[PDB]
Design a protein around this ligand. Structure first.
Ligand SMILES: OC[C@H]1O[C@@H]2O[C@H]3[C@H](O)[C@@H](O)[C@@H](O[C@H]4[C@H](O)[C@@H](O)[C@@H](O[C@H]5[C@H](O)[C@@H](O)[C@@H](O[C@H]6[C@H](O)[C@@H](O)[C@@H](O[C@H]7[C@H](O)[C@@H](O)[C@@H](O[C@H]1[C@H](O)[C@H]2O)O[C@@H]7CO)O[C@@H]6CO)O[C@@H]5CO)O[C@@H]4CO)O[C@@H]3CO
Ligand SMILES: [Ca+2]
Ligand SMILES: [Ca+2]
Ligand SMILES: [Ca+2]
Ligand SMILES: [Ca+2]
Length: 632
């Protein structure tokens, strides 16, 4: 009954090992309880059935200043009733069979680990036995002993999962099995670009993120601002974000808070308006449905009035820091650090400044009830040569009554539940377990939430029209010089998420909010934008484009290690190809007949170590090849 935690002390070398457990119950005040050294060398602790969901911290029991050591430093390792886990010498937190007396095979790499190498050398081990067997992707069972290796992913096409089952029998005669899953990832090169003249100092975020993906700069089209999405399509996305990267996810337990999760920004223009579609996600339904408010439409962004901004760069030469200027009735000049801040019932610090060049802020609000919504122009130079947003010349775009939704000067905004994208990509790691930078690691636990129960109605959309005559531009300007744009989401003051995504949205995500340390300091800190804006209409003139080359993702549908006579499907995928792609599959250099398809079925006759390959050629003669190992 209960749960068990084991600790490998062979590297830490602590005289006494303590374990501190918190969550459903606290085992004891820090430093916790003494673990028991076993003759295996491992240290062991047990927790009763009452300790249903715990976070575990190991430590040497010593005080600050007298040699205190602990691991992890903040967020404990997850352990639930019914589990038996071990912290290895390499500091992997792994399943170690189950909390009973049976034998089990286990891996020294944590279950559900993703990897981008061609294989992952996963070491195998046995608990309460000394021989086991393994089956990988349905292979015949093959014996193994402690220390042996399995090349997980060997031979396989990228973006496939690998199943690995370990079999053992203990002294009690009970045959057990432990099934593991690993993901071999593949990431195609993406065409990306930037220009020095915009003052940006951080490269556009990539991976799942993208600024002007596939060189999409928006489209010339008339949009109907009405909350219906049939007038948009995926080709019009100028900034691709990800789901579940809003700051709350980096706190130990902040999934109860309303998300501010930007997903994608689309743009179009005609001769009258500049148009935008903003998609926001709410994955709480899937990640933490126990948090009733956040996993419900009580989380809709128009529940309360929260500032939202479209930062635009019309004149590319101007740099506006965010500072604002105005005049008093007596002619005296004043400045504020941001156009809106500690303003009318927001009594919190925070804002978003700009290094990347902008000169215009469309300052609006999430339920379109702020009669002060305005287009601010950075039309006044400060002493340092930067420009300040001018209260005196702002263009009012606010409603006269919330009920009426009658925005001034032709500004149009509609919001609704809905989702335009048919994929919602983000990280689905357990709550509390997120780490800094993990949104840029392709081996984090990325999912398409539509494969995990997401529904269109979970998300939120805003459709917006900004009249060109409020921006000092026309369609010719957009199509010939272009402009830049970024959407900013707040939770009142400071930024929380942006499109394009900027790392200042997360640089302090794991720090405590002044008024409530359960939630994120990102709600109140000072952010500063350093990535490129998304271009609309045309690239900046000094843009350097980094073109992704033609490339192939190739391999088997089954892990290396299959039995003779098993049909193995060799698959090939192409990226950045021109025209038709022809694929030539080979095994030890000998061709396999594939028709003119992207797949071939190879049935190995005899044992051996085969070199499987593909050569791909497109209609402009670009060539890509891949060669992999497959063992029978
Ligand atoms: O207690 C478990 C803790 O023990 C060890 O931490 C030392 C620590 O090094 C000392 O500084 C001191 O802690 C002081 C704090 O310095 C002081 O600020 C205050 O702490 C309060 C917090 O300020 C307040 O936010 C709240 O804390 C929450 C917290 O926000 C949650 O995230 C959660 O904290 C967990 C930690 O994340 C986790 O690492 C672990 O902490 C260990 C720590 O690793 C170790 O070095 O467990 C906690 C869960 O208990 O929950 C807490 C509480 O809800 O409340 C605390 C009030 O305690 O006071 C503490 C005195 O404890 O002393 C501890 C040794 O106890
Ligand atoms: Ca529409
Ligand atoms: Ca997001
Ligand atoms: Ca920040
Ligand atoms: Ca912030």
């Amino acid at each position: 009954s209960g749960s068990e935690a084991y600790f490998d002390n062979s590297k830490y070398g602590w005289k006494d090992v303590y374990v501190y457990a918190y969550g459903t119950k606290e085992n004891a005040e820090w430093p916790g309880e003494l673990m028991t050294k076993e003759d295996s060398g491992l240290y062991k602790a047990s927790f009763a059935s009452s300790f249903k969901s715990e976070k575990i911290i190991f430590n040497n029991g010593l005080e600050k200043g007298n040699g205190k050591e602990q691991y992890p430093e903040a967020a404990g390792l997850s352990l639930k009733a019914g589990e038996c886990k071990m912290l290895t010498a390499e500091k992997q937190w792994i399943d170690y069979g189950k909390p009973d007396d049976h034998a089990y095979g286990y891996t020294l790499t944590a279950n559900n680990t993703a990897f981008s190498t061609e294989s992952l050398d996963v070491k195998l081990a046995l608990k309460n036995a000394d021989k086991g067997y393994y089956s990988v992707d349905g292979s015949a069972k093959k014996e193994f002993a402690n220390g042996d290796s399995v090349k997980v992913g060997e031979g396989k096409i990228g973006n496939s999962k690998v199943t690995l089952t370990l079999y053992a029998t203990g002294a009690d005669g009970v045959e057990t099995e432990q099934t593991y899953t690993f993901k071999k990832t593949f990431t195609a090169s993406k065409t990306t670009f930037s220009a020095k003249s915009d003052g940006h100092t951080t490269a556009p975020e990539s991976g799942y993120y993208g600024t002007n993906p596939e060189m999409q700069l928006g489209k010339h089209k008339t949009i109907s601002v009405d909350g219906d999405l049939s007038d948009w399509d995926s080709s019009m996305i100028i900034a691709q974000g990800v789901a579940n990267d809003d700051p709350r996810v980096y706190m130990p337990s902040s999934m109860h808070e309303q998300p501010w999760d930007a997903y994608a920004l689309y743009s179009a223009w005609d001769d009258d308006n500049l148009y935008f579609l903003l998609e926001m996600a709410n994955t709480t339904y899937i990640t933490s449905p126990e948090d009733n408010f956040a996993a419900s439409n009580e989380a809709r962004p128009w529940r309360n009035s929260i500032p939202m901004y479209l930062a635009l760069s019309i004149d590319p030469a101007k740099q506006a820091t965010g500072k604002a200027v105005g005049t008093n009735k007596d002619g005296s000049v004043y400045t504020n650090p941001f156009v809106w801040g500690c303003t009318n019932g927001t009594a919190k610090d925070g804002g978003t400044g700009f290094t990347t060049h902008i000169d215009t802020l469309v300052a609006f609000d999430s339920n379109n009830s702020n009669g002060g919504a305005s287009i601010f122009k950075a039309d006044t130079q400060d002493t340092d040569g930067t420009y300040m947003f001018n209260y005196d010349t702002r263009i009012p775009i606010g409603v006269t009554s919330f009920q009426a939704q009658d925005n001034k000067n032709g500004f149009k905004i509609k919001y609704a539940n809905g989702t335009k994208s048919t994929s919602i990509f983000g990280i689905n790691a357990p709550k509390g377990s997120r780490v800094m930078g993990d949104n840029l690691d392709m081996n984090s636990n990325w999912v398409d939430f539509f494969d995990e129960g997401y529904k269109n109605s979970y998300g939120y959309v805003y459709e917006i029209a900004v009249p060109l005559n409020t921006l000092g531009i026309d369609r010719s300007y957009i199509e010939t010089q272009g402009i830049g744009a970024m959407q900013i989401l707040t939770y009142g003051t400071s930024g929380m998420d942006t499109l394009p995504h900027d790392p200042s949205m997360l640089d302090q995500a794991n720090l405590e909010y002044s008024y409530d340390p359960s939630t994120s300091h990102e709600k109140e800190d000072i952010d500063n934008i350093t990535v490129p804006l998304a271009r609309i209409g045309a690239l900046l003139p000094d843009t350097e484009v980094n073109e992704a080359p033609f490339e192939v993702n190739f391999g088997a549908n089954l892990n290396s290690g299959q039995s003779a006579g098993t049909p193995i499907t060799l698959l090939a995928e192409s990226y950045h190809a021109t025209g038709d792609v022809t694929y030539s599959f080979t095994v030890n250099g000998e061709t396999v007949q594939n028709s003119n398809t992207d797949s071939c079925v190879w049935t190995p006759s005899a044992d051996g170590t085969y070199s499987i390959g593909v050569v791909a050629v497109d209609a402009n003669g670009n060539k890509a090849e891949s060669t992999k190992t497959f063992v029978v």
